[PDB]
Amino acid sequence: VAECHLEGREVMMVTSGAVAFGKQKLAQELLMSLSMRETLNLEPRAAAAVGQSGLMSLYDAMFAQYGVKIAQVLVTKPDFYNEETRNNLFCTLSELISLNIVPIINTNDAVSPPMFIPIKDNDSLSAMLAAEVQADLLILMSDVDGIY
Amino acid sequence: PTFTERSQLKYARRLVVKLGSAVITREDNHGLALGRLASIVEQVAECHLEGREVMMVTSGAVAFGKQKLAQELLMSLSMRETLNLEPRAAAAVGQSGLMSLYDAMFAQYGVKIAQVLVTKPDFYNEETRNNLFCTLSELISLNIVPIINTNDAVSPPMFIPIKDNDSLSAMLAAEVQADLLILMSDVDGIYNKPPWEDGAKLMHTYTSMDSKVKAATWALDRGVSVVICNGMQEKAIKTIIGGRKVGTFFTEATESANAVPVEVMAENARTGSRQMQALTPAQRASAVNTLADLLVSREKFILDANAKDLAEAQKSGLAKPLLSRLSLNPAKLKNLSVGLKQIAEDSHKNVGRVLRRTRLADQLELKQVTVPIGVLLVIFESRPDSLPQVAALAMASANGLLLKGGKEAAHSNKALMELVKEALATVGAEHAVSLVSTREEISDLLSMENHIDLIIPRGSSDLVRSIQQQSLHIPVLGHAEGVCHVYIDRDADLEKALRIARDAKCDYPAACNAMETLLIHEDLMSGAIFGDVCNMLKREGVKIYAGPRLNQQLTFGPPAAKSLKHEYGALECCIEVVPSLDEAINHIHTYGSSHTDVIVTENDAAARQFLGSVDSACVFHNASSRFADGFRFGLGAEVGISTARIHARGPVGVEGLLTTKWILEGQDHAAADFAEGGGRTWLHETLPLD
Amino acid sequence: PTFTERSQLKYARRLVVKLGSAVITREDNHGLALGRLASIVEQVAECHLEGREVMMVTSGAVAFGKQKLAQELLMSLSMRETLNLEPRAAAAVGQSGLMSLYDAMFAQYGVKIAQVLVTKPDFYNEETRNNLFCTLSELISLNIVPIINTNDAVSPPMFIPIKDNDSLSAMLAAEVQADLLILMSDVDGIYNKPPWEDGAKLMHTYTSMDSKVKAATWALDRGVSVVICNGMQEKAIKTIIGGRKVGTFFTEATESANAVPVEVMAENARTGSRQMQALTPAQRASAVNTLADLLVSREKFILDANAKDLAEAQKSGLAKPLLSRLSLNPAKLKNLSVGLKQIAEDSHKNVGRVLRRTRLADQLELKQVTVPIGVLLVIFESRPDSLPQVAALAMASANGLLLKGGKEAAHSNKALMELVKEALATVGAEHAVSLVSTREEISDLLSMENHIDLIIPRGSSDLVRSIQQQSLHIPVLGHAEGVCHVYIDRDADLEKALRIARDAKCDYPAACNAMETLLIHEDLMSGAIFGDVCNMLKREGVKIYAGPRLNQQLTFGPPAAKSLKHEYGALECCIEVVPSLDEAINHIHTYGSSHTDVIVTENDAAARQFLGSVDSACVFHNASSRFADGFRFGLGAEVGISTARIHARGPVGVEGLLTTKWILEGQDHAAADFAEGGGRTWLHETLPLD
């Protein structure tokens, strides 16, 4: 992405997987808080918060290794019904992209996970976004080889 | 509110820290203030590696974002344009960068963080509010510092009603039911009037920026106790929780603690002075007389007052002097009754005595007369005896008096206070005397100006030095070191010098004016006197040190002396020996604190030159250093001893508590009238004062 | 050394900062002190984003490594062992972690860093040394902050000779030929004796820890100028380069600047006092007399001294008062010659006057006599006239005197100083008078204790307030605000009150005792007086404000007043009007600074009660507030005006410059002798002093 953005294009990442990272960190900081006796014999929201913070820090370091700068924009389900809010969000995204800054969008899992076009994950959000910003190409880097 | 006093904060279990947008970013807007951020993060990391539960509410993402956007915009113009910031985008950039910085700074301490971003609508859906608080609790209970901030990126709430990152802090710290809420703004606290005026005093306690005050009040009514400090002050959090006085403390105590706190009692007594000033002829003489019979008529009340107070203090057993000089007996009162009955008659013309009478022109006769000082402040130990004794001067000097001792002998103090305020209520129409003990935060009273006039430490040399190290911006009295000295001349009879050193040291070594050194002519070492003195010492068991010109002089000798300017207070006294009187002169001026010196000699030429040349507070001749008591001077009941060189030399009697004032009674005279155009000649005829 | 004065540091081009291992790590050894590290890195980043060239020499990799190794060792024991550090490895770990932290903190400012690790042998191969310095220069010239440290990992040099991270700093900063070298240790600077003693004074300048001193000396001889400060002090670098006095400055100036610097001149004059104390009978009277003819015999030298000095100052044109009251004329000297010739005769018995004569027992006759204060310090503006005038009191008060004005009128000051020190050299055998002007760092002299006694600001109300805001730990004299007041009673004749307000204000509005308010009875507003006063004002063009009870009272009226406690100093004077004399009383006590007040009235009952109740420094009756001059009091040449309530009330004449002392001439008396066992009775017979 850094080299496809140091070439003139305008990338805009939509990261998922804050919850998994948070679950790892919470497992560690829980196992490291039992009494010595118990050793001898994970709500999604908290994990989401921890994972989001740690992941943004990692992204920031990795990108600043290339001179690029990033910024995180956290949206929710209701923020796509207030038309004034939707327009403000897209004006913000455009103003950011036009300054050679890679935004990073993710659903505000910390206080209102949308899991509980209808936005239901970090995929429908990607489709809606890339349709509104009127991007050219939309890449879905899943874990499967494609479609069978 | 579970906390009321600023000393109960060491037990604060759940904190909530807020960082105003003026603490984070610098002024010239060229980056962060890593100094203040790292100081605050170090303080939080160590207040969280100690068991507490902190939860920061950071503001100032917008300022940081504006900086970053200014840079990344200026770095995107065409080279030609060079040669001649919506809040949302800046908020996003700043939030990301700031979280990264926090994460690095905290991970430098093993701690972990997590960011929770809330909005305005997320505080109306009760299910959402409950989920948020369950999340916050589950996070705090895992030893993870959350960091809350409004989601400025997509819905800044700027456009209890949450309107900023302050009302949010209040609402949060009220819902999590934290103990302490710290608002680290950029101002020093809270003033009564804006800082650019007169009267811009700092309120160290808010008794029950307008946004901060509003939120602080709302949050106080839910049990939370808030403290507002200056973020740009070093070691802010660790000294607030440390208990020391910093910033403004919001609390409720006013009805709980007392209604006689500090200030009016100064002005009340001050006005009482103005009143008591009108009680000169035999009136204040009666004021001590009405207290005379009172003390002889209320033994039972004051004895039991001290008895149970002596009783509850004896079990403590702090140290000898308090445990020895805190009791009370009707015997002492008879000693107290006889003194003030003499202080009754002697003070007939303290105030209102004429000093100068000079006529400048016809019907132009100025003069200069005595006036009381006003609101004193005498500071003493747990000794209920001096309190009604030195007050006998106050009611003899028509001047307002305050008092402060300690927690010990309290019950006797309150009783003795109702004794005297009564007498003033009997005659005086007003109590210009107010005991305000019980941790008045001695500096607090000391920091006051134009209310009190003079400080007089009474307790002991330990208490007086605490003042000298603390006292500032206010006149001070009272001895600090009683490093007396003696001298023996090469023609001085020994047996006198023996009993003198005997009397000077073996009378009351606890006194300030007790001698703590002694000198002799060097030629006298061959006069067998050295043994005779050390003989007298062992007769009383006096630990003797020695000085350089003595150490080399004697072979076996006594042990060495640490520093000639040292003091003992017990049966110890160095001995130095020097040939030259001039060296002896230089010795005192270089080591002696000019407190009290003496000579003993049989050559008057040395006497006359010794006395006149030395500059002690008082010199003597064939006498002890145990006369600095004022009473023995035939002067009267002093109130202390002066080391300074202004207004007071040694025994501060009654005159040391007065002050002068000029009046002038003209008829039609003016200043330019004195010029040759006006028929005004300057007579300056000093007429005899009546 | 290209720099000598601590104000020449703003132009330091190449710095070298060193960070002792006690600045980086905390005390309890539980992580870094991110507070101090981030403060130092912020200061360096902003002193390097300003054009300078910094180059840090960090120490303390070993301590950080020891912490990390303790952790990673305690976290590697078997669970059973839990239930009941070679320098090299710690150095490696600490170096890596510390470089990472530095890199993050600096990249927060856009700056870039690079680490250069040297050893002991790398300073002997001359080709290696030259390559190293070429590398350092090539790095610095690219706006990159290098960070040098000894390669502790594989060859710690602990086991000019490089022996630590200090000698390395000296060698480096000498080879790169830097300008300033900062050693940020953990101590406050350099003391003469170790801090746990008496005499542990901080040397603010080292005139040409033992390792630091050794390296600092060696580095000073190569042009480098070193400064040693306390790393644990906030904003250390930015205030050193800022020029302010912090830490110890190593320099060479002593022979360059002067040989009469500060301290001895105090004690020299102090000893001169001891000498001049022996010049009472017509001697110090001659001392002013030998200066009397001197001033009438050296006009040419002093006129040209001031003439060219007036001349070189006129082109500057700072402001009116200096530009107006700096010139000198033989006319002024004739005015100067007549004053001190009167000061000659009047001071015949200032020192040595008996105050008390009381006999306690047979051949036991104490007394109390006058004594000079000692080493004064009077602070004044560019006014060569007062200097030989107030000094005429010093030589009349047998007390040591210092002086400090400014750079203006300097040549006249030095000349006037050689005038007087001569007179003392003629009679006095010693000059107990020393002018030490030219930026004595007023606080420096003020910070001194037991050398000087009293401060007397002379310049103007601006100068005196600078003292009051600065002055501490030392007695102070001198007025601060001359907020005078007047009052008119409801039975007071108008035309008198007219000329009084006329005279009080239109004589010299620049005076401190010039009235800056005026009150009238409310009933008198219907007596046509209000116009008559404002009529008189416009006759002189006096800008009039008004107060609350006046503002509402009049409809058209004059403009409003900012604050009743304000002062003008020019032709401006508020007017308030109040019915109650008691309110008028309360008005002064609440607003007036008790400096100088007056009444004008035809009802004596009001007069008697007004005067006695008010507590100004001096009150009057049918007269102006323009009498506070001492000379007009028929008292003598005063030296100022006292706002305080101790030792001095209004015009400090000659008595205000003396002090008392007790002597006692016994024969064989002792303290315990007074007890009933010894035949000693207390007579206390006050005998008439001769």
Numbering used by the authors:
A (entry chain B): 88 to 128, 140 to 214, 228 to 259
B (entry chain C), C (entry chain A): 45 to 128, 140 to 214, 228 to 276, 295 to 776
Text taken from the publication that reported this structure:
The bifunctional enzyme Δ1-pyrroline-5-carboxylate synthase (P5CS) is vital to the synthesis of proline and ornithine, playing an essential role in human health and agriculture. The P5CS molecule contains two domains, GK and GPR, catalyzing the first and second steps in the biosynthesis of proline from glutamate. The GK domain catalyzes glutamate phosphorylation, and the GPR domain catalyzes the NADPH-dependent reduction of γ-glutamyl phosphate (G5P) to glutamate-γ-semialdehyde (GSA). Our results describe the assembly mechanism of P5CS filaments, in which the GK domain forms tetramer and the GPR domain forms dimer structure, and both domains form specific interaction interfaces.
Filaments in three conditions with (1) glutamate (P5CSGlu), (2) glutamate and ATPγS (P5CSGlu/ATPγS), and (3) glutamate, ATP, and NADPH (P5CSMix) were imaged in cryo-EM for single-particle analysis (SPA). Long and flexible filaments of P5CS were observed under all the three conditions. After 3D classification and 3D reconstruction, the electron density maps of the P5CSGlu, P5CSGlu/ATPγS, and P5CSMix filaments reached resolutions of 4.0 Å, 4.2 Å, and 3.6 Å, respectively. (C) When all substrates (MgSO4, ATP, NADPH, and glutamate) were added to induce the reaction, the long P5CSMix filaments were observed, which is similar to the P5CSGlu filaments. We chose the P5CSMix filament to display the details. In the helical P5CS filament structure, the GK tetramers serve as the core of the filament, and the GPR dimers form left-handed double helix structures around the central axis. The overall diameter of P5CS filaments in all three states is 180 Å, while the helical twist is 68° and the helical rise is 60 Å. In P5CSGlu/ATPγS and P5CSMix filaments, the additional interface between hook structures pairs locks adjacent GK tetramers. The hook interaction forms strong contacts via hydrogen bonds (M119-R124, L121-M123) and salt bridges (E116-R124). In the P5CSGlu filament, the GK and GPR domains are likely in a stable conformational state, while vibration may occur in the GPR domain of P5CSGlu/ATPγS and P5CSMix filaments due to the binding of ligands. We propose that the interactions among the hook pairs are required for stabilizing the filament during the transformation from the P5CSGlu filament to the P5CSGlu/ ATPγS filament or P5CSMix filament.
